Amino acid sequence: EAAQAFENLANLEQEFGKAEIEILKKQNELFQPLFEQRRDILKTINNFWVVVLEAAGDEISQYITPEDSVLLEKLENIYVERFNEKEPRDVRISLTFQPNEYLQDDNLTLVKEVRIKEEKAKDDEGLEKKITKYTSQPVDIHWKPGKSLFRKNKKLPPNFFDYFQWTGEEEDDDFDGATLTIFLAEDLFPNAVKYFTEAMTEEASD
Amino acid sequence: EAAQAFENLANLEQEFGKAEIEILKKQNELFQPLFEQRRDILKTINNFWVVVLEAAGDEISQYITPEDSVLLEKLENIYVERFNEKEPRDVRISLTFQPNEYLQDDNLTLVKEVRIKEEKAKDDEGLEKKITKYTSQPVDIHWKPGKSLFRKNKKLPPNFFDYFQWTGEEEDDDFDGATLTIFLAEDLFPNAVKYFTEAMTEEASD
């Protein structure tokens, strides 16, 4: 009776979806006020977020170049927020910088908005398959002269700030912005103080 | 002022922890009847779980031996229960088998209970650090004569069923049971249908 089983599984997957949506809303309700309070504290701590970014594992460190790191020292805060009620997986990632040698003063807050939507795509023999698609508008950054950290061609390996130009709309792209978005929103941001504290208690190699 | 900030962060971490526990409880509350209904369905689909296990990736395949596969061909269900009301991260993982040549009939359900616990240890500086530890009691499997898949000693590269002998309290066993527990409970079990459907896709184009 496999036909019935898999039809029932499909029905059940829909219920799982509705439950996940309820959980996301509950999560946003409980954690956002705490993240807001945390944000006010973290802004007072020198180099908090650059230490966190470089201690969070390979998913981030694979992108961070020495030139990136210098700018990130002026990163005052990172905030992550699920802003779209009608699409609760959508995330806004905001980086707030102090004045620095890379960014013009009228562009010290870098905002990345990632739309995360259920889509479908024909597979093998033309069967529809549910996929979660991650897309975003490209974010133009007002770099000071000679200080742009945007690659112009994809011969160059992507650095951290290439994330802002990632759209998720290119078959081309080698930059896995979807995985980075998930890591930032679900791992790095919620566990920031732990990452910082672990980094501040790291020992030498010798 | 670093001192006041970090004191405040530590207090806030406690609130984050409480929120996290509440979310996990809510998540279990919504997902449990759905996973239970799914379990009854999957029970009817022969070789569902061996296909899922073989499609899971290196996290599983690194343990799977030819003899493991034979026994896993008789695997009827994998069920994950968060049984501890106080600690929603605790998991009871049950592997149910059809009658086979490896297991005595009185031991066709292999139950693994893994308990987590926020522990504490001093670093070389002298300061206590918070460490999340995964522990479990060894499970006595009633093998049929000369069919034990437990390794003789902690020397030969471990197979999948050595997991039931993993405790997490041995100073050096090479079996990373903590990672396997997490993968089973958070990845393989929730995404099982997708793993199965995808595997069936791929071996239908060949």
Curated annotation (Swiss-Prot), chains A, B:
Molecular function (GO) terms for this protein are: chromatin binding; histone binding; histone chaperone activity
Question: Is Transmembrane found in the keyword set?
Answer: no
Give me the Gene Ontology terms describing cellular component.
CENP-A containing chromatin; chromatin; chromosome, centromeric region; nucleoplasm; nucleus
Stated name of the protein: Putative nucleosome assembly protein C36B7.08c
Tell me where it mainly resides.
Answer: nucleus
Q: Which family does it belong to?
A: Belongs to the nucleosome assembly protein (NAP) family.
Keyword annotations for this protein?
Nucleus, Phosphoprotein
Q: Where in the cell is it found?
A: Nucleus
Q: Name the source organism.
A: Schizosaccharomyces pombe (strain 972 / ATCC 24843)
Q: Name one process (GO BP) from the record.
A: CENP-A eviction from euchromatin
The range of the complete sequence contained here reads: 2 to 207 of 244
